[PDB]
PDB file of C-alpha atoms and ligand atoms in Angstrom:
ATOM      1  CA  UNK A1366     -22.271  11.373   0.657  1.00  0.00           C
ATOM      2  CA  UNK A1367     -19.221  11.499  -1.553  1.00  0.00           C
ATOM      3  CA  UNK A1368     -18.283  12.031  -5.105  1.00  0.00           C
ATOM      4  CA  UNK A1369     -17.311   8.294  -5.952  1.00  0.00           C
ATOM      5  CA  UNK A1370     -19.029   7.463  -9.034  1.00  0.00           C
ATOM      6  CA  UNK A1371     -18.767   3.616 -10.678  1.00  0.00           C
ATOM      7  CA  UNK A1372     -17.758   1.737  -7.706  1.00  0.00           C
ATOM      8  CA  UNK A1373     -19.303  -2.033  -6.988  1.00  0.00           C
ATOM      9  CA  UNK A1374     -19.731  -2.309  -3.527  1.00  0.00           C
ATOM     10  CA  UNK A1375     -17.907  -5.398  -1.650  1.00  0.00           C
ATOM     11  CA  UNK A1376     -18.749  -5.107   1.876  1.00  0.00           C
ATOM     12  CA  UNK A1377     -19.775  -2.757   4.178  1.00  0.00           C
ATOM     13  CA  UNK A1378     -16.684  -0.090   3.663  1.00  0.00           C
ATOM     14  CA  UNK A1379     -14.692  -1.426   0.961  1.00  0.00           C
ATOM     15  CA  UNK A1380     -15.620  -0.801  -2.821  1.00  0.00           C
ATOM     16  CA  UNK A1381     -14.178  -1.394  -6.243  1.00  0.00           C
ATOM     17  CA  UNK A1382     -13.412   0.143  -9.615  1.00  0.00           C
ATOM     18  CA  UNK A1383     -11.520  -0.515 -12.254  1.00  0.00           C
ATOM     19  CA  UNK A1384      -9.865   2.884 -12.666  1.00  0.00           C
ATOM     20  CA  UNK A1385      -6.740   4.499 -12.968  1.00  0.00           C
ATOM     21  CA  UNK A1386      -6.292   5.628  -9.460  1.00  0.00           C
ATOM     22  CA  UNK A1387      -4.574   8.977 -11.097  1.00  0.00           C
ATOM     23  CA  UNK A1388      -7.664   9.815 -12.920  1.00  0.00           C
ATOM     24  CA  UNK A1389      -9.582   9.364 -10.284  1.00  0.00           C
ATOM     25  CA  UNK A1390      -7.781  11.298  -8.165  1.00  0.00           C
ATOM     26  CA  UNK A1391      -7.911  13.942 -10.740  1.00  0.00           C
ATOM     27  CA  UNK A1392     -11.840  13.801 -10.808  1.00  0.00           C
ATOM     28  CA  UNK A1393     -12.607  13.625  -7.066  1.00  0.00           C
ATOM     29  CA  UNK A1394      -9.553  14.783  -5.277  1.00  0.00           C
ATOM     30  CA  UNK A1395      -9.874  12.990  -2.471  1.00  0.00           C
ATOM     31  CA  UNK A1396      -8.890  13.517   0.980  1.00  0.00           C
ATOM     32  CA  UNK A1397      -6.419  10.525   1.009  1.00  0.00           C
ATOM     33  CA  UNK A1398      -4.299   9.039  -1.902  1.00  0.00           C
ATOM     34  CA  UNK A1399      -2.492   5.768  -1.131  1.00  0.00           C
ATOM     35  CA  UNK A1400       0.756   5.108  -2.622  1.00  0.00           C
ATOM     36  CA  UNK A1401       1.802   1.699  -3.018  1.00  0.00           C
ATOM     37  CA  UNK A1402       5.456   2.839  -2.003  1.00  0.00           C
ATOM     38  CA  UNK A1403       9.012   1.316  -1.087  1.00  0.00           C
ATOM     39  CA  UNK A1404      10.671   2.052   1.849  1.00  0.00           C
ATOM     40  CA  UNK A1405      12.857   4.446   0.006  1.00  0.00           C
ATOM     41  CA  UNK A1406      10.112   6.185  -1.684  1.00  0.00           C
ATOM     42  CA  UNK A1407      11.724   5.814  -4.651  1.00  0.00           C
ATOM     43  CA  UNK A1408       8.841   6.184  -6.843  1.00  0.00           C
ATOM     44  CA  UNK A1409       9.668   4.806 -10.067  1.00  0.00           C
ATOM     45  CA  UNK A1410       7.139   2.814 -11.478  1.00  0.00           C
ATOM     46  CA  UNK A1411       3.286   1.178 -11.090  1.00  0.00           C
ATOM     47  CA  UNK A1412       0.916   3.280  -8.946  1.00  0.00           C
ATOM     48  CA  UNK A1413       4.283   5.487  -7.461  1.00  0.00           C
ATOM     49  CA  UNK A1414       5.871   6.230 -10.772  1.00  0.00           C
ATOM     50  CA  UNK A1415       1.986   6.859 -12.102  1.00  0.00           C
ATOM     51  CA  UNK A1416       1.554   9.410  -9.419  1.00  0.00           C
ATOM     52  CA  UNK A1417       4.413  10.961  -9.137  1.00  0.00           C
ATOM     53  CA  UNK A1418       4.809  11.706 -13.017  1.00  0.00           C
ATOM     54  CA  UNK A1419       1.102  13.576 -12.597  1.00  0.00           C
ATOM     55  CA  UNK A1420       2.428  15.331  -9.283  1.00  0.00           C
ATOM     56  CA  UNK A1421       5.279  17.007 -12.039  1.00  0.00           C
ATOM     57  CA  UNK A1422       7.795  15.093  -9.641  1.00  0.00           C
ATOM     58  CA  UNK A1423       6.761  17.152  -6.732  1.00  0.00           C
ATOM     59  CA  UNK A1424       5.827  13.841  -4.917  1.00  0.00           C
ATOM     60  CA  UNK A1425       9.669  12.356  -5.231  1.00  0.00           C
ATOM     61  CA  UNK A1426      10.811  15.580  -4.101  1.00  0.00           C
ATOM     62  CA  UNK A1427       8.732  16.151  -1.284  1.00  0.00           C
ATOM     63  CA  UNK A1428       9.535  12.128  -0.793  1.00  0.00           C
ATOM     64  CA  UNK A1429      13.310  12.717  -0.571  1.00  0.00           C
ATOM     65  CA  UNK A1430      13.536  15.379   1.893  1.00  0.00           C
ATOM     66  CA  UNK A1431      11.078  13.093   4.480  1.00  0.00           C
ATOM     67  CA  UNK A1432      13.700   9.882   3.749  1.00  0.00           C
ATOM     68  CA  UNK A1433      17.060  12.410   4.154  1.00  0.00           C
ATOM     69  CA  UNK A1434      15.174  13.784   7.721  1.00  0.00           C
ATOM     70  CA  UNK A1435      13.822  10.469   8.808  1.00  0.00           C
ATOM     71  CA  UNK A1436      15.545   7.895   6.794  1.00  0.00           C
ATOM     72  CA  UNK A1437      13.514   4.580   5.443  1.00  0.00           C
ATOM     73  CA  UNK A1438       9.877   3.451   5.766  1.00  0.00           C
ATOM     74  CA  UNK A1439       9.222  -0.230   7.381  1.00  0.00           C
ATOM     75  CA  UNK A1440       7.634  -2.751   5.073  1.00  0.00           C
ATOM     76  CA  UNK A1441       4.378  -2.752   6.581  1.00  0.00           C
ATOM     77  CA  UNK A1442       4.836   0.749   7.365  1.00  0.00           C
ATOM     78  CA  UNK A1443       3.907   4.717   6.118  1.00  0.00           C
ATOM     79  CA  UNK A1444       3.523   8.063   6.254  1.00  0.00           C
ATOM     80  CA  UNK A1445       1.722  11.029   5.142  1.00  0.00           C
ATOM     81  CA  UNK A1446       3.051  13.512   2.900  1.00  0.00           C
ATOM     82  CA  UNK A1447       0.821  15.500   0.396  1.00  0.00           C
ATOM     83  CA  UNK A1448      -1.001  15.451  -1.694  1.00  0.00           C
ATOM     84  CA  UNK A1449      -0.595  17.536  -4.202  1.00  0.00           C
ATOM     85  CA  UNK A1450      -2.613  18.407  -7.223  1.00  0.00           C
ATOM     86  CA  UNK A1451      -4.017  15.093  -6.368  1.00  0.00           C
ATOM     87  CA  UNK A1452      -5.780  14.647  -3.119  1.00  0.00           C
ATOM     88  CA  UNK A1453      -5.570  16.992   0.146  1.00  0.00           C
ATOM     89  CA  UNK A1454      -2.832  13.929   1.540  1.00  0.00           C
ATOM     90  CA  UNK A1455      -0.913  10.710   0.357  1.00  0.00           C
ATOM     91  CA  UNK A1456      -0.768   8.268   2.657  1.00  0.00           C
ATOM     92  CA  UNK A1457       2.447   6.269   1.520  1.00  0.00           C
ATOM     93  CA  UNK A1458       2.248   2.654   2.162  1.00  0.00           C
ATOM     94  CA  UNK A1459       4.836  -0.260   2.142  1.00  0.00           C
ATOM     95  CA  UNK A1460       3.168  -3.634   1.138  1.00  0.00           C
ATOM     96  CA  UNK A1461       5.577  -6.027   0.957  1.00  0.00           C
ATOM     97  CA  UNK A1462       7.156  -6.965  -2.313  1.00  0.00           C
ATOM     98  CA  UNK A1463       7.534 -10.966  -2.333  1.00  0.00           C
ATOM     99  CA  UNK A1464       9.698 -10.277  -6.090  1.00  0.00           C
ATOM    100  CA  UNK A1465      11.960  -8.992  -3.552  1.00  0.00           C
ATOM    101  CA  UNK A1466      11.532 -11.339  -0.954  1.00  0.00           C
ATOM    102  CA  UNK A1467       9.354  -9.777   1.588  1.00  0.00           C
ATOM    103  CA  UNK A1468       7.311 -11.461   4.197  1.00  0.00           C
ATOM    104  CA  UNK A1469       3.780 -11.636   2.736  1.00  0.00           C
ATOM    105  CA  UNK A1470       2.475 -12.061   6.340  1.00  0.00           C
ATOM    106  CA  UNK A1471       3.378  -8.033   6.551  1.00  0.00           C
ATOM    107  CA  UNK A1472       0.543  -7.393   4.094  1.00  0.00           C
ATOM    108  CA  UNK A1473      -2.247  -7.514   6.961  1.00  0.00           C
ATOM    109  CA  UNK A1474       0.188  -4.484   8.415  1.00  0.00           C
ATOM    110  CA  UNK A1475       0.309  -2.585   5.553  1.00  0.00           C
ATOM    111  CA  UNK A1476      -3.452  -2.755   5.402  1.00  0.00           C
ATOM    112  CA  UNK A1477      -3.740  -1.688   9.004  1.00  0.00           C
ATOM    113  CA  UNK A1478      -2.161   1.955   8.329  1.00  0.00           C
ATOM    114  CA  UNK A1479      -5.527   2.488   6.239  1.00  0.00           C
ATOM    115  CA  UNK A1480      -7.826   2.504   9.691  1.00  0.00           C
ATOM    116  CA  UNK A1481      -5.767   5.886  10.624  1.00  0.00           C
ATOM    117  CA  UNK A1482      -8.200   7.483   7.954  1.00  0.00           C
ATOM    118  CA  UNK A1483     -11.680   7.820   7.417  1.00  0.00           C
ATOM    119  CA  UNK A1484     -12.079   7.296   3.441  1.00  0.00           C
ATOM    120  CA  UNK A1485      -9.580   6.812   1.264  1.00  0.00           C
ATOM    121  CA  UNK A1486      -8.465   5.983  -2.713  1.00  0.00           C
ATOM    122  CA  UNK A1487      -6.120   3.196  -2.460  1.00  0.00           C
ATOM    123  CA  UNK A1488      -4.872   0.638  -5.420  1.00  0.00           C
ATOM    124  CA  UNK A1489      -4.709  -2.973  -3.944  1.00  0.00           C
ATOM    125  CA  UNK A1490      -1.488  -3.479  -1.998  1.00  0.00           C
ATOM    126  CA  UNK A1491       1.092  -6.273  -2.806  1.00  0.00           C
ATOM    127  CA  UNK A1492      -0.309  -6.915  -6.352  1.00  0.00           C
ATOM    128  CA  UNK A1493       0.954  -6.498  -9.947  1.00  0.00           C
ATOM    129  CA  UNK A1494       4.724  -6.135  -9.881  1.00  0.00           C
ATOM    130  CA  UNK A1495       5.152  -6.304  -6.322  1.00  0.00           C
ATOM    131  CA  UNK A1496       4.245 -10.019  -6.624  1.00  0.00           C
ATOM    132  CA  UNK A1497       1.913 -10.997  -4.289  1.00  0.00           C
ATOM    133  CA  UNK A1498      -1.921 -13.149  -4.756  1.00  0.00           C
ATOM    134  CA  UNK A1499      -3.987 -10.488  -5.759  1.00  0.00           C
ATOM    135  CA  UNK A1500      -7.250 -12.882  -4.520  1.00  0.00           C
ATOM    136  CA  UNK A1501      -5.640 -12.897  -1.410  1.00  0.00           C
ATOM    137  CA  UNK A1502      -4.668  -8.935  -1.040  1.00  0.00           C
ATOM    138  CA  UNK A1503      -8.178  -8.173  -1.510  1.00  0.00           C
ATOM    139  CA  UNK A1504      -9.316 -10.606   1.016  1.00  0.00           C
ATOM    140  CA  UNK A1505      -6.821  -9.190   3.253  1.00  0.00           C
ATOM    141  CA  UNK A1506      -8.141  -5.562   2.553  1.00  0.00           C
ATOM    142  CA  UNK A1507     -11.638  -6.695   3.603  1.00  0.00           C
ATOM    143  CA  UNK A1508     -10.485  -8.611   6.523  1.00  0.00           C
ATOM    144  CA  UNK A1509      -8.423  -5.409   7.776  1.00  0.00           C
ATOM    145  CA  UNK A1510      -9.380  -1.951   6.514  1.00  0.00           C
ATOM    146  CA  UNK A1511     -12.640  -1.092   8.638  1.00  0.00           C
ATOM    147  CA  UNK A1512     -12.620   3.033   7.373  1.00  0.00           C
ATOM    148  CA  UNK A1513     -14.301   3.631   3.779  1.00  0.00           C
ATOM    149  CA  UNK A1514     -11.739   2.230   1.368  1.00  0.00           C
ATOM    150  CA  UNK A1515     -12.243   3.045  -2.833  1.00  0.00           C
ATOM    151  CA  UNK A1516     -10.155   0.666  -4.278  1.00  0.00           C
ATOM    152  CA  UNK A1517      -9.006   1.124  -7.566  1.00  0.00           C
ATOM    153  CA  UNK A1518      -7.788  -1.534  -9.976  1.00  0.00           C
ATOM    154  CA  UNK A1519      -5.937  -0.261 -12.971  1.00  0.00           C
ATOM    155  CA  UNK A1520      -5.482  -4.224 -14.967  1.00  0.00           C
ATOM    156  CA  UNK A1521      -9.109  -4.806 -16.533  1.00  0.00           C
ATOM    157  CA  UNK A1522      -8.692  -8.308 -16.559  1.00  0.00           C
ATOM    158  CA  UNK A1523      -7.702  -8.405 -12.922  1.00  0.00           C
ATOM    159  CA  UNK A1524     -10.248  -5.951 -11.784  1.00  0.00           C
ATOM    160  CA  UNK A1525     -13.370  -9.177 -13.417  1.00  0.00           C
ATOM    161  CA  UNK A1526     -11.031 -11.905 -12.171  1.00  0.00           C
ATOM    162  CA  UNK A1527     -11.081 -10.455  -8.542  1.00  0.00           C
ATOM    163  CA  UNK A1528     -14.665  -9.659  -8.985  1.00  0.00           C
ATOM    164  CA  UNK A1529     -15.868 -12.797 -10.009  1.00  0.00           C
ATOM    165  CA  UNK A1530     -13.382 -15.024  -7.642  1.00  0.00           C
ATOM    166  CA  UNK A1531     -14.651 -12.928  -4.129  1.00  0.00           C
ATOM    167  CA  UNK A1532     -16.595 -14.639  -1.720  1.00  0.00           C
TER     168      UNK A1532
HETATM  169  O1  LIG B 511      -3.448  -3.577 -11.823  1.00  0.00           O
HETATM  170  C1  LIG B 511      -3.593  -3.324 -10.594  1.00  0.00           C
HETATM  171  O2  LIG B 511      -4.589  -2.757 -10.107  1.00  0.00           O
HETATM  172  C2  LIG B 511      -2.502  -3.722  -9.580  1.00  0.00           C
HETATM  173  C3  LIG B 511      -1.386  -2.663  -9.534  1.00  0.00           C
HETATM  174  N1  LIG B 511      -2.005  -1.379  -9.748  1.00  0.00           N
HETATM  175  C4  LIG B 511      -1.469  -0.394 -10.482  1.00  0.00           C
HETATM  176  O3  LIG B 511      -0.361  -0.443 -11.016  1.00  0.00           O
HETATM  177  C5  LIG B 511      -2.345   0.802 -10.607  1.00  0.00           C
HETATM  178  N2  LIG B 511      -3.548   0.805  -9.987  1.00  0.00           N
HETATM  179  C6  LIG B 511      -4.352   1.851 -10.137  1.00  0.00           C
HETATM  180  N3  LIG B 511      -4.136   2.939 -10.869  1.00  0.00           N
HETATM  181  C7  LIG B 511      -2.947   2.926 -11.491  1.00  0.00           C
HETATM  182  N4  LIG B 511      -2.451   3.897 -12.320  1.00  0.00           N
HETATM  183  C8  LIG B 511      -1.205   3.523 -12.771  1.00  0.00           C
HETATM  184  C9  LIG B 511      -0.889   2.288 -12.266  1.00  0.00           C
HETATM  185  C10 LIG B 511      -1.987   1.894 -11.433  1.00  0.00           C
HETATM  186  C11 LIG B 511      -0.585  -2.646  -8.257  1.00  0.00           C
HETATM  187  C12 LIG B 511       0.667  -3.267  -8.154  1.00  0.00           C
HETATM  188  C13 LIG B 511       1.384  -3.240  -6.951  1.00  0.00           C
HETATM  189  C14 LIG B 511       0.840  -2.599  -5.837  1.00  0.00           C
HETATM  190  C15 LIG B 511      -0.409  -1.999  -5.936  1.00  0.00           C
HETATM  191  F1  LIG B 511      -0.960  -1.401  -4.851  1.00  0.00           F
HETATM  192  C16 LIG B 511      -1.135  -2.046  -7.124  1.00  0.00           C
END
């Protein structure tokens, strides 16, 4: 038992919200945070910009020591960095971003880090501005992630259309 509150259950271990996954970090601090990252962990806007700005900018800093030691994330890739005020860990991940010209078939990849963790707050990979089918990232998600996934969906119009559209 867990302090998740609001979520509309999908399948066995994956659930929904629509939620900004900052606040609900900020409520239940959880023991992972996903980032929807780049490779360079530049984190400038959407869910990285969002969680960076409430980390005070710890998160990029933390971020560019890990890229100037290890140098860049795969697409499909990640790592785990803190935290923060925010959850116990961040789990960075790389979906790819098809605006950019990624190969979508890397998205079933980038859902695969998730099964390193038991439970985790994640936003849905690949969507919004990195460009992918949102439908199909959440079928993806289901398809892949078999640990306890919270997803949270910040776009309230997105959040009924993937609701209503999942089989
Ligand atoms: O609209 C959506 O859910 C899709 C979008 N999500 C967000 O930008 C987002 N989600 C949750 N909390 C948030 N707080 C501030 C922004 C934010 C997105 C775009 C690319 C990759 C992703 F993994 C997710």
């Amino acid at each position: 038992v867990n302090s998740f509150s609001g979520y509309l259950k999908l399948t066995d271990n994956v659930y929904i919200k629509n939620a900004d996954i900052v606040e609900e970090a900020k409520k239940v601090k959880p023991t992972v945070v996903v980032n929807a990252a780049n490779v360079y962990l530049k984190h400038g806007g959407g869910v990285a910009g969002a969680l960076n700005k409430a980390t005070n900018n710890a998160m990029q800093v933390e971020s560019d020591d890990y890229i100037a030691t290890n140098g860049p994330l795969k697409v499909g890739g990640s790592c785990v960095l803190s935290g923060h005020n925010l959850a116990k860990h961040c789990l960075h991940v790389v979906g790819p971003n098809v605006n950019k010209g990624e190969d979508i078939q890397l998205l079933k990849s980038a859902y695969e880090n998730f099964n390193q963790h038991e439970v985790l707050l994640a936003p849905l990979l690949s969507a919004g501005i990195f460009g992918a089918d949102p439908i199909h990232s959440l079928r993806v998600c289901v398809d892949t992630v078999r640990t306890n996934v919270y997803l949270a969906v910040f776009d309230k119009n997105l959040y009924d259309k993937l609701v209503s559209s999942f089989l």
